[PDB]
Amino acid sequence: MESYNIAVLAGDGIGPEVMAEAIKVLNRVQEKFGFKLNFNEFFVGGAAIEHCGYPLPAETLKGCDQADAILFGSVGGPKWTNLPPDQQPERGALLPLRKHFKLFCNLRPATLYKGLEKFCPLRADIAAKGFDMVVVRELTGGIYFGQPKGREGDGVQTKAFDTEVYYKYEIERIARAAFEAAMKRNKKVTSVDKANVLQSSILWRETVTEMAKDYPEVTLEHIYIDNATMQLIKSPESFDVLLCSNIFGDIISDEAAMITGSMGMLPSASLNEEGFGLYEPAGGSAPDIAGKGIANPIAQILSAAMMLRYSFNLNEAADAIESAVQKVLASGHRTADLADDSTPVSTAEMGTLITQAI
Amino acid sequence: MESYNIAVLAGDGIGPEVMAEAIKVLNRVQEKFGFKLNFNEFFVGGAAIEHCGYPLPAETLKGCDQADAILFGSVGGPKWTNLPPDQQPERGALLPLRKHFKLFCNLRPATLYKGLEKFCPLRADIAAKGFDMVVVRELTGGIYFGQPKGREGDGVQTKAFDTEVYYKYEIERIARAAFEAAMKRNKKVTSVDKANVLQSSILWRETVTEMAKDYPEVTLEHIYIDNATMQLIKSPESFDVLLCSNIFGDIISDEAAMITGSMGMLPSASLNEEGFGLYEPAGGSAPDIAGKGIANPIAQILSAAMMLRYSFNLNEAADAIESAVQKVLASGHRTADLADDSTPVSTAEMGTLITQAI
Ligand SMILES: NC(=O)c1ccc[n+]([C@@H]2O[C@H](COP(=O)([O-])OP(=O)(O)OC[C@H]3O[C@@H](n4cnc5c(N)ncnc54)[C@H](O)[C@@H]3O)[C@@H](O)[C@H]2O)c1
Ligand SMILES: NC(=O)c1ccc[n+]([C@@H]2O[C@H](COP(=O)([O-])OP(=O)(O)OC[C@H]3O[C@@H](n4cnc5c(N)ncnc54)[C@H](O)[C@@H]3O)[C@@H](O)[C@H]2O)c1
Ligand SMILES: C=C(C)CONC(=O)C(=O)O
Ligand SMILES: C=C(C)CONC(=O)C(=O)O
Ligand SMILES: [Mg+2]
């Protein structure tokens, strides 16, 4: 009789669309295995800018505080380009959210599904080898949050700046999260930095290496961010855990999403040291397809399939949604973003096919 | 006939190996096209460390000060991991060289040669659409040179930091180079930033946008760095000029190199406002293969071609090198990096074959 409380935040763009299908798939999971979910929905992002007037209004932050997990869509859109930097949906809501709940550990699992190599935009012989990867991205530190940042001066000497700064304890905790995930997988961690140039990357590399002494079963490799970007295309199969800074993990996880077939595949979990977890798709609000019922809901759906995994240890419920996405796709069903030409289904139609595989 | 004075800084790892082939190609190009190069060789990087105790000896910097152009291989490797940050080949030699000669404009032309699509690691239908773009990368500013940078504190409170800082004049001159490049190509500039988060990217985007008013014949599009990483895989054909910060250009250009088939294919030019140039492969010293005579010399050879073109306007000589490369590849010869189930030619064989095709 487990009754948990989710604070659903849909956001902007394809946010509200794919969020409906995530609920759809859940409700079947609820009455299928035996638990309740009490979905309380709030406004965040540019939506909260004309339904409250502020990207993260007090009410919204309050609902999260009271839930056992936040289900999240995405924010951002061209409508809010021209607000001040601090008051847009990205700096105004999402980055604050992450910092407020100290959600330092970002998990983005990217895998090529059995027999789905058609989706993969790589060459057939590369895609054949398949791949199964988890990006462990430091989420609350680094250049996205560092101080100082701002703009000063005038004219051609106007100067703008951001600070890629890390404190050792921030590196230690995300590194631990990486080695623990590796222990539960294939015992390989690839740490990605630019330690031949950046001072912060030198500290990253040294701390990760120190941390490795508490995990002698894990193989630790170090690679530079520019090389990482080739290796993902050339040998995606050689990766297990990808340990990354905030900005490098941002970059690398989209590349990984693409090689699995689309941005619409990659789910994500953002967890703090307590296990409290926000669950959003890795990608953004996709303005160019927002409002049209064409948008892969898999990433949003599988997110909740991670929420019941990590926030609530309900493995059978999570293994359900996951093998239900595998079966719909195994049957040749589909949204437009994925390769192969055959009448795509809408977001709704993908939501249903999957809710049915439940 | 007066010679041009070429400082040859082959460096570490595969550097000496591929530089030897560039010199062999250049000697034949000199005969066939009537011009004279005076090669003066200098130690740099790890090799200079082993000879002098210094990664950038005063003798080497003198040599470059006295040269008409610099032909550079690559620096760095495992032998030097444990040196103090400022003695290492990369911070101690390459970055200072770029900074000393004010080589703000980095040009990396990535092209998939018509007929070599089996080399491209993208899916065959994607690779069929073609790929021909040039990264225009700001090379002397941004996080790789910003201050403050360093490390402070101790224990878990140790912090390390680097500053991504741009002045408007730095963005203006690199933006201008990208729009001029676009004017000679297909009149599209795609500018890469992270303007939804970074103050420095906001200034980047604003300044590029304002520079575009000077180029009504050119399309300007703005894309986020994480998304750019996907678009290169999904739609390589859509790119013409890719305008990037120092670190973002560093990152994306390795991905561009890989989709042309190998890091070993991508040459580069680094130019200051007076047109003085340093020419080097875009990639590193390849320590995993260094000394085995298997590295692809094409990047170094095409770097020498850019030298002739950009430093000396010997355009016919540079065209011949490019065509000789394409003919050898069309004839089925390939080094081990170029995907094929044939016996690969060595580094020195590839150089000889290119030389004979001049
Ligand atoms: N998590 C977030 O809230 C977050 C993260 C990234 C970007 N954004 C915001 O999103 C907006 C657009 O940014 P972007 O275009 O660089 O990133 P994006 O991820 O939104 O889109 C990149 C490309 O992938 C496609 N795509 C993304 N999700 C898809 C899905 N579910 N199904 C099918 N296609 C999908 C888009 O159509 C687009 O072509 C911006 O305002 C940005 O600030 C928000
Ligand atoms: N301009 C420079 O001097 C420069 C630039 C980048 C890296 N580096 C240094 O190079 C060293 C290696 O760095 P890395 O491994 O990240 O980058 P890398 O570019 O040297 O190698 C990346 C991968 O590409 C392969 N590769 C590169 N050039 C090749 C060629 N000519 N033919 C066949 N394969 C090739 C390598 O074998 C490796 O597997 C490091 O010390 C790094 O600091 C130097
Ligand atoms: C929404 C932002 C603050 C930009 O951050 N971007 C990501 O997390 C991503 O692109 O995955
Ligand atoms: C050797 C360095 C100073 C690191 O720089 N790396 C690049 O410039 C690249 O990947 O091109
Ligand atoms: Mg690079």
mmCIF file of N, CA and C in Angstrom, chain A residues 9-110:
data_model
loop_
_atom_site.group_PDB
_atom_site.id
_atom_site.type_symbol
_atom_site.label_atom_id
_atom_site.label_comp_id
_atom_site.label_asym_id
_atom_site.label_seq_id
_atom_site.Cartn_x
_atom_site.Cartn_y
_atom_site.Cartn_z
ATOM 1 N N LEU A 9 6.175 18.660 -12.949
ATOM 2 C CA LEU A 9 6.459 19.976 -13.525
ATOM 3 C C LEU A 9 6.698 19.810 -15.022
ATOM 4 N N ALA A 10 5.742 20.285 -15.832
ATOM 5 C CA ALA A 10 5.743 19.995 -17.265
ATOM 6 C C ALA A 10 6.653 20.939 -18.045
ATOM 7 N N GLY A 11 6.588 22.232 -17.751
ATOM 8 C CA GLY A 11 7.472 23.188 -18.380
ATOM 9 C C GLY A 11 6.965 23.771 -19.683
ATOM 10 N N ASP A 12 7.855 23.856 -20.671
ATOM 11 C CA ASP A 12 7.597 24.536 -21.931
ATOM 12 C C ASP A 12 7.862 23.584 -23.089
ATOM 13 N N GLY A 13 7.479 24.018 -24.289
ATOM 14 C CA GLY A 13 7.761 23.232 -25.482
ATOM 15 C C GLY A 13 7.047 21.891 -25.468
ATOM 16 N N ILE A 14 7.792 20.823 -25.744
ATOM 17 C CA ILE A 14 7.220 19.483 -25.767
ATOM 18 C C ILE A 14 7.049 18.987 -24.341
ATOM 19 N N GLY A 15 7.270 19.860 -23.363
ATOM 20 C CA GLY A 15 7.179 19.476 -21.972
ATOM 21 C C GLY A 15 5.816 18.911 -21.617
ATOM 22 N N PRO A 16 4.775 19.747 -21.732
ATOM 23 C CA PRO A 16 3.413 19.274 -21.420
ATOM 24 C C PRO A 16 2.939 18.117 -22.292
ATOM 25 N N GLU A 17 3.327 18.075 -23.571
ATOM 26 C CA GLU A 17 2.939 16.963 -24.433
ATOM 27 C C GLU A 17 3.460 15.640 -23.887
ATOM 28 N N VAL A 18 4.786 15.480 -23.837
ATOM 29 C CA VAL A 18 5.345 14.204 -23.407
ATOM 30 C C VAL A 18 5.014 13.901 -21.951
ATOM 31 N N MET A 19 4.671 14.915 -21.151
ATOM 32 C CA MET A 19 4.336 14.652 -19.753
ATOM 33 C C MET A 19 3.021 13.887 -19.638
ATOM 34 N N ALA A 20 2.055 14.190 -20.513
ATOM 35 C CA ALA A 20 0.783 13.472 -20.498
ATOM 36 C C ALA A 20 0.991 11.980 -20.721
ATOM 37 N N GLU A 21 1.911 11.622 -21.613
ATOM 38 C CA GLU A 21 2.159 10.218 -21.904
ATOM 39 C C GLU A 21 2.924 9.527 -20.783
ATOM 40 N N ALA A 22 3.743 10.275 -20.042
ATOM 41 C CA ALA A 22 4.423 9.694 -18.893
ATOM 42 C C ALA A 22 3.415 9.313 -17.819
ATOM 43 N N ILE A 23 2.480 10.214 -17.524
ATOM 44 C CA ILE A 23 1.396 9.876 -16.610
ATOM 45 C C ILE A 23 0.622 8.673 -17.139
ATOM 46 N N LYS A 24 0.169 8.755 -18.393
ATOM 47 C CA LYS A 24 -0.561 7.656 -19.019
ATOM 48 C C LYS A 24 0.080 6.302 -18.723
ATOM 49 N N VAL A 25 1.387 6.188 -18.961
ATOM 50 C CA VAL A 25 2.059 4.914 -18.746
ATOM 51 C C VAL A 25 2.109 4.569 -17.264
ATOM 52 N N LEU A 26 2.246 5.575 -16.398
ATOM 53 C CA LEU A 26 2.312 5.311 -14.965
ATOM 54 C C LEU A 26 1.005 4.722 -14.451
ATOM 55 N N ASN A 27 -0.109 5.415 -14.692
ATOM 56 C CA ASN A 27 -1.392 4.968 -14.160
ATOM 57 C C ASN A 27 -1.625 3.488 -14.422
ATOM 58 N N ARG A 28 -1.273 3.005 -15.612
ATOM 59 C CA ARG A 28 -1.368 1.570 -15.845
ATOM 60 C C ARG A 28 -0.414 0.809 -14.933
ATOM 61 N N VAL A 29 0.789 1.349 -14.719
ATOM 62 C CA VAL A 29 1.744 0.696 -13.830
ATOM 63 C C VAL A 29 1.226 0.698 -12.398
ATOM 64 N N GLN A 30 0.624 1.810 -11.964
ATOM 65 C CA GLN A 30 0.030 1.896 -10.634
ATOM 66 C C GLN A 30 -0.900 0.718 -10.367
ATOM 67 N N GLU A 31 -2.040 0.686 -11.060
ATOM 68 C CA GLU A 31 -3.039 -0.360 -10.881
ATOM 69 C C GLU A 31 -2.599 -1.716 -11.417
ATOM 70 N N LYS A 32 -1.370 -1.855 -11.909
ATOM 71 C CA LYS A 32 -0.881 -3.142 -12.387
ATOM 72 C C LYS A 32 -0.101 -3.906 -11.327
ATOM 73 N N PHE A 33 0.694 -3.206 -10.516
ATOM 74 C CA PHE A 33 1.566 -3.843 -9.540
ATOM 75 C C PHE A 33 1.165 -3.593 -8.097
ATOM 76 N N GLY A 34 0.473 -2.493 -7.812
ATOM 77 C CA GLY A 34 -0.023 -2.264 -6.472
ATOM 78 C C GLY A 34 0.662 -1.141 -5.720
ATOM 79 N N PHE A 35 0.556 0.081 -6.237
ATOM 80 C CA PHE A 35 0.976 1.267 -5.501
ATOM 81 C C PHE A 35 0.212 2.459 -6.053
ATOM 82 N N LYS A 36 0.190 3.535 -5.276
ATOM 83 C CA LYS A 36 -0.488 4.761 -5.665
ATOM 84 C C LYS A 36 0.527 5.874 -5.874
ATOM 85 N N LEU A 37 0.230 6.753 -6.831
ATOM 86 C CA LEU A 37 1.011 7.958 -7.072
ATOM 87 C C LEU A 37 0.061 9.144 -7.072
ATOM 88 N N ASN A 38 0.365 10.148 -6.250
ATOM 89 C CA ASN A 38 -0.505 11.305 -6.034
ATOM 90 C C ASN A 38 0.087 12.505 -6.768
ATOM 91 N N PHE A 39 -0.235 12.606 -8.060
ATOM 92 C CA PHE A 39 0.352 13.608 -8.949
ATOM 93 C C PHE A 39 -0.192 14.994 -8.631
ATOM 94 N N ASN A 40 0.670 15.862 -8.109
ATOM 95 C CA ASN A 40 0.364 17.269 -7.886
ATOM 96 C C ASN A 40 1.217 18.097 -8.838
ATOM 97 N N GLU A 41 0.564 18.886 -9.689
ATOM 98 C CA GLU A 41 1.208 19.554 -10.813
ATOM 99 C C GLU A 41 1.357 21.045 -10.545
ATOM 100 N N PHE A 42 2.489 21.605 -10.973
ATOM 101 C CA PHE A 42 2.813 23.012 -10.777
ATOM 102 C C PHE A 42 3.292 23.608 -12.099
ATOM 103 N N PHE A 43 3.579 24.908 -12.071
ATOM 104 C CA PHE A 43 4.076 25.655 -13.220
ATOM 105 C C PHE A 43 5.547 26.002 -13.016
ATOM 106 N N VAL A 44 6.355 25.802 -14.059
ATOM 107 C CA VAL A 44 7.777 26.138 -14.023
ATOM 108 C C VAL A 44 8.219 26.559 -15.419
ATOM 109 N N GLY A 45 9.231 27.426 -15.473
ATOM 110 C CA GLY A 45 9.796 27.860 -16.736
ATOM 111 C C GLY A 45 9.122 29.095 -17.285
ATOM 112 N N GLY A 46 9.041 29.201 -18.613
ATOM 113 C CA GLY A 46 8.310 30.304 -19.216
ATOM 114 C C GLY A 46 6.813 30.242 -18.972
ATOM 115 N N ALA A 47 6.274 29.037 -18.757
ATOM 116 C CA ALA A 47 4.866 28.905 -18.397
ATOM 117 C C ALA A 47 4.562 29.672 -17.121
ATOM 118 N N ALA A 48 5.383 29.472 -16.087
ATOM 119 C CA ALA A 48 5.224 30.195 -14.833
ATOM 120 C C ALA A 48 5.461 31.691 -14.981
ATOM 121 N N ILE A 49 5.876 32.155 -16.159
ATOM 122 C CA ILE A 49 6.110 33.583 -16.340
ATOM 123 C C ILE A 49 4.806 34.321 -16.655
ATOM 124 N N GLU A 50 3.812 33.633 -17.235
ATOM 125 C CA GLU A 50 2.497 34.218 -17.487
ATOM 126 C C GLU A 50 1.367 33.413 -16.846
ATOM 127 N N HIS A 51 1.683 32.554 -15.881
ATOM 128 C CA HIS A 51 0.687 32.006 -14.977
ATOM 129 C C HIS A 51 1.014 32.337 -13.534
ATOM 130 N N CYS A 52 2.120 33.046 -13.299
ATOM 131 C CA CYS A 52 2.485 33.580 -11.994
ATOM 132 C C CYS A 52 3.261 34.880 -12.176
ATOM 133 N N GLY A 53 4.120 34.926 -13.196
ATOM 134 C CA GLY A 53 4.969 36.072 -13.461
ATOM 135 C C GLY A 53 6.439 35.869 -13.148
ATOM 136 N N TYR A 54 6.845 34.674 -12.709
ATOM 137 C CA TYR A 54 8.221 34.402 -12.311
ATOM 138 C C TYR A 54 8.564 32.963 -12.677
ATOM 139 N N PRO A 55 9.773 32.707 -13.196
ATOM 140 C CA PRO A 55 10.077 31.364 -13.720
ATOM 141 C C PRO A 55 9.974 30.259 -12.682
ATOM 142 N N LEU A 56 10.280 30.542 -11.418
ATOM 143 C CA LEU A 56 10.110 29.575 -10.336
ATOM 144 C C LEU A 56 9.406 30.301 -9.199
ATOM 145 N N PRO A 57 8.077 30.265 -9.167
ATOM 146 C CA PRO A 57 7.339 30.987 -8.129
ATOM 147 C C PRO A 57 7.273 30.187 -6.835
ATOM 148 N N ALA A 58 7.096 30.925 -5.736
ATOM 149 C CA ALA A 58 7.152 30.316 -4.410
ATOM 150 C C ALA A 58 6.311 29.046 -4.346
ATOM 151 N N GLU A 59 5.057 29.125 -4.806
ATOM 152 C CA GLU A 59 4.175 27.961 -4.791
ATOM 153 C C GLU A 59 4.877 26.745 -5.365
ATOM 154 N N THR A 60 5.434 26.896 -6.567
ATOM 155 C CA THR A 60 6.045 25.771 -7.261
ATOM 156 C C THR A 60 7.141 25.131 -6.417
ATOM 157 N N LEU A 61 8.052 25.945 -5.883
ATOM 158 C CA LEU A 61 9.129 25.399 -5.061
ATOM 159 C C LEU A 61 8.581 24.661 -3.845
ATOM 160 N N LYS A 62 7.444 25.124 -3.317
ATOM 161 C CA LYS A 62 6.851 24.521 -2.128
ATOM 162 C C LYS A 62 6.362 23.104 -2.410
ATOM 163 N N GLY A 63 5.709 22.899 -3.555
ATOM 164 C CA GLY A 63 5.202 21.577 -3.878
ATOM 165 C C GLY A 63 6.297 20.532 -3.949
ATOM 166 N N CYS A 64 7.442 20.893 -4.527
ATOM 167 C CA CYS A 64 8.555 19.952 -4.597
ATOM 168 C C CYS A 64 9.019 19.547 -3.205
ATOM 169 N N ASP A 65 9.261 20.532 -2.344
ATOM 170 C CA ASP A 65 9.678 20.286 -0.972
ATOM 171 C C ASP A 65 8.873 19.175 -0.319
ATOM 172 N N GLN A 66 7.594 19.071 -0.673
ATOM 173 C CA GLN A 66 6.677 18.168 0.008
ATOM 174 C C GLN A 66 6.519 16.820 -0.680
ATOM 175 N N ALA A 67 7.088 16.636 -1.865
ATOM 176 C CA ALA A 67 6.959 15.373 -2.572
ATOM 177 C C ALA A 67 8.143 14.462 -2.274
ATOM 178 N N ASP A 68 7.969 13.181 -2.593
ATOM 179 C CA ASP A 68 9.030 12.185 -2.506
ATOM 180 C C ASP A 68 9.784 11.998 -3.826
ATOM 181 N N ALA A 69 9.532 12.861 -4.812
ATOM 182 C CA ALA A 69 10.155 12.791 -6.129
ATOM 183 C C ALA A 69 9.508 13.812 -7.061
ATOM 184 N N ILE A 70 10.306 14.469 -7.892
ATOM 185 C CA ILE A 70 9.808 15.468 -8.829
ATOM 186 C C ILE A 70 9.915 14.887 -10.229
ATOM 187 N N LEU A 71 8.795 14.835 -10.937
ATOM 188 C CA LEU A 71 8.783 14.500 -12.354
ATOM 189 C C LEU A 71 8.744 15.804 -13.143
ATOM 190 N N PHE A 72 9.657 15.957 -14.098
ATOM 191 C CA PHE A 72 9.932 17.252 -14.705
ATOM 192 C C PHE A 72 9.994 17.114 -16.217
ATOM 193 N N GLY A 73 9.516 18.139 -16.915
ATOM 194 C CA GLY A 73 9.560 18.133 -18.370
ATOM 195 C C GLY A 73 10.785 18.802 -18.959
ATOM 196 N N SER A 74 10.670 20.093 -19.277
ATOM 197 C CA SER A 74 11.804 20.934 -19.630
ATOM 198 C C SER A 74 11.296 22.357 -19.816
ATOM 199 N N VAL A 75 12.211 23.327 -19.689
ATOM 200 C CA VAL A 75 11.852 24.739 -19.824
ATOM 201 C C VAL A 75 12.624 25.356 -20.981
ATOM 202 N N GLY A 76 12.354 26.614 -21.264
ATOM 203 C CA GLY A 76 13.079 27.291 -22.315
ATOM 204 C C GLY A 76 12.283 27.370 -23.603
ATOM 205 N N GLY A 77 12.455 28.486 -24.309
ATOM 206 C CA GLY A 77 11.799 28.736 -25.567
ATOM 207 C C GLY A 77 12.143 30.116 -26.096
ATOM 208 N N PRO A 78 11.966 30.316 -27.403
ATOM 209 C CA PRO A 78 12.263 31.635 -27.988
ATOM 210 C C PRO A 78 11.390 32.768 -27.456
ATOM 211 N N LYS A 79 10.238 32.470 -26.847
ATOM 212 C CA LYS A 79 9.381 33.541 -26.346
ATOM 213 C C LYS A 79 10.072 34.360 -25.264
ATOM 214 N N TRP A 80 11.017 33.761 -24.542
ATOM 215 C CA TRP A 80 11.596 34.388 -23.360
ATOM 216 C C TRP A 80 13.054 34.791 -23.562
ATOM 217 N N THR A 81 13.546 34.722 -24.801
ATOM 218 C CA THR A 81 14.876 35.183 -25.180
ATOM 219 C C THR A 81 15.223 36.525 -24.554
ATOM 220 N N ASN A 82 14.288 37.475 -24.596
ATOM 221 C CA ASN A 82 14.596 38.886 -24.388
ATOM 222 C C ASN A 82 14.408 39.358 -22.952
ATOM 223 N N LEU A 83 14.052 38.469 -22.029
ATOM 224 C CA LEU A 83 14.053 38.829 -20.624
ATOM 225 C C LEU A 83 15.499 38.997 -20.162
ATOM 226 N N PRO A 84 15.713 39.559 -18.975
ATOM 227 C CA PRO A 84 17.066 39.609 -18.440
ATOM 228 C C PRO A 84 17.609 38.205 -18.268
ATOM 229 N N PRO A 85 18.934 38.034 -18.335
ATOM 230 C CA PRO A 85 19.496 36.684 -18.160
ATOM 231 C C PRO A 85 18.999 35.971 -16.906
ATOM 232 N N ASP A 86 18.973 36.662 -15.762
ATOM 233 C CA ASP A 86 18.616 36.037 -14.491
ATOM 234 C C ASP A 86 17.142 35.644 -14.391
ATOM 235 N N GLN A 87 16.287 36.095 -15.308
ATOM 236 C CA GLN A 87 14.848 35.911 -15.161
ATOM 237 C C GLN A 87 14.241 35.061 -16.271
ATOM 238 N N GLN A 88 15.063 34.383 -17.053
ATOM 239 C CA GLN A 88 14.600 33.463 -18.078
ATOM 240 C C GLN A 88 14.365 32.089 -17.471
ATOM 241 N N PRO A 89 13.818 31.143 -18.246
ATOM 242 C CA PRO A 89 13.462 29.839 -17.654
ATOM 243 C C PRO A 89 14.659 28.994 -17.248
ATOM 244 N N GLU A 90 15.778 29.071 -17.978
ATOM 245 C CA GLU A 90 16.937 28.220 -17.703
ATOM 246 C C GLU A 90 17.703 28.676 -16.459
ATOM 247 N N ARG A 91 18.228 29.906 -16.468
ATOM 248 C CA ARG A 91 18.858 30.417 -15.252
ATOM 249 C C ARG A 91 17.831 30.715 -14.168
ATOM 250 N N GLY A 92 16.587 31.010 -14.551
ATOM 251 C CA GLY A 92 15.600 31.454 -13.583
ATOM 252 C C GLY A 92 14.909 30.339 -12.830
ATOM 253 N N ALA A 93 14.838 29.144 -13.411
ATOM 254 C CA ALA A 93 14.087 28.074 -12.770
ATOM 255 C C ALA A 93 14.904 26.799 -12.605
ATOM 256 N N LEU A 94 15.353 26.220 -13.724
ATOM 257 C CA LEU A 94 15.955 24.889 -13.690
ATOM 258 C C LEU A 94 17.260 24.883 -12.904
ATOM 259 N N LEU A 95 18.204 25.755 -13.266
ATOM 260 C CA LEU A 95 19.442 25.828 -12.494
ATOM 261 C C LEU A 95 19.165 26.116 -11.026
ATOM 262 N N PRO A 96 18.326 27.089 -10.670
ATOM 263 C CA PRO A 96 17.945 27.233 -9.256
ATOM 264 C C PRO A 96 17.394 25.952 -8.645
ATOM 265 N N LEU A 97 16.448 25.289 -9.315
ATOM 266 C CA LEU A 97 15.904 24.037 -8.798
ATOM 267 C C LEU A 97 17.014 23.064 -8.425
ATOM 268 N N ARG A 98 17.912 22.794 -9.375
ATOM 269 C CA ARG A 98 18.973 21.824 -9.139
ATOM 270 C C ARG A 98 19.786 22.210 -7.916
ATOM 271 N N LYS A 99 20.141 23.490 -7.812
ATOM 272 C CA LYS A 99 20.959 23.930 -6.692
ATOM 273 C C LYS A 99 20.184 23.838 -5.383
ATOM 274 N N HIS A 100 18.889 24.174 -5.415
ATOM 275 C CA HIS A 100 18.104 24.252 -4.186
ATOM 276 C C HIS A 100 17.998 22.901 -3.495
ATOM 277 N N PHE A 101 17.771 21.836 -4.256
ATOM 278 C CA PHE A 101 17.684 20.496 -3.692
ATOM 279 C C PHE A 101 19.022 19.766 -3.705
ATOM 280 N N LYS A 102 20.118 20.487 -3.963
ATOM 281 C CA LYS A 102 21.470 19.924 -3.975
ATOM 282 C C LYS A 102 21.540 18.630 -4.785
ATOM 283 N N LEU A 103 20.957 18.664 -5.987
ATOM 284 C CA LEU A 103 20.916 17.514 -6.897
ATOM 285 C C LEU A 103 22.203 17.445 -7.726
ATOM 286 N N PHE A 104 23.290 17.064 -7.051
ATOM 287 C CA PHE A 104 24.618 17.127 -7.653
ATOM 288 C C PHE A 104 24.861 16.020 -8.680
ATOM 289 N N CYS A 105 24.182 14.882 -8.573
ATOM 290 C CA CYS A 105 24.503 13.717 -9.396
ATOM 291 C C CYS A 105 23.474 13.536 -10.516
ATOM 292 N N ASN A 106 23.909 13.712 -11.764
ATOM 293 C CA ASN A 106 23.042 13.597 -12.934
ATOM 294 C C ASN A 106 23.386 12.317 -13.684
ATOM 295 N N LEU A 107 22.380 11.465 -13.890
ATOM 296 C CA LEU A 107 22.546 10.150 -14.503
ATOM 297 C C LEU A 107 21.799 10.128 -15.831
ATOM 298 N N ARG A 108 22.516 9.822 -16.910
ATOM 299 C CA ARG A 108 21.936 9.801 -18.251
ATOM 300 C C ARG A 108 22.344 8.497 -18.911
ATOM 301 N N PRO A 109 21.468 7.480 -18.876
ATOM 302 C CA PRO A 109 21.818 6.171 -19.427
ATOM 303 C C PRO A 109 21.438 6.063 -20.885
ATOM 304 N N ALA A 110 22.412 5.769 -21.745
ATOM 305 C CA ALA A 110 22.226 5.704 -23.191
ATOM 306 C C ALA A 110 22.615 4.313 -23.665
#
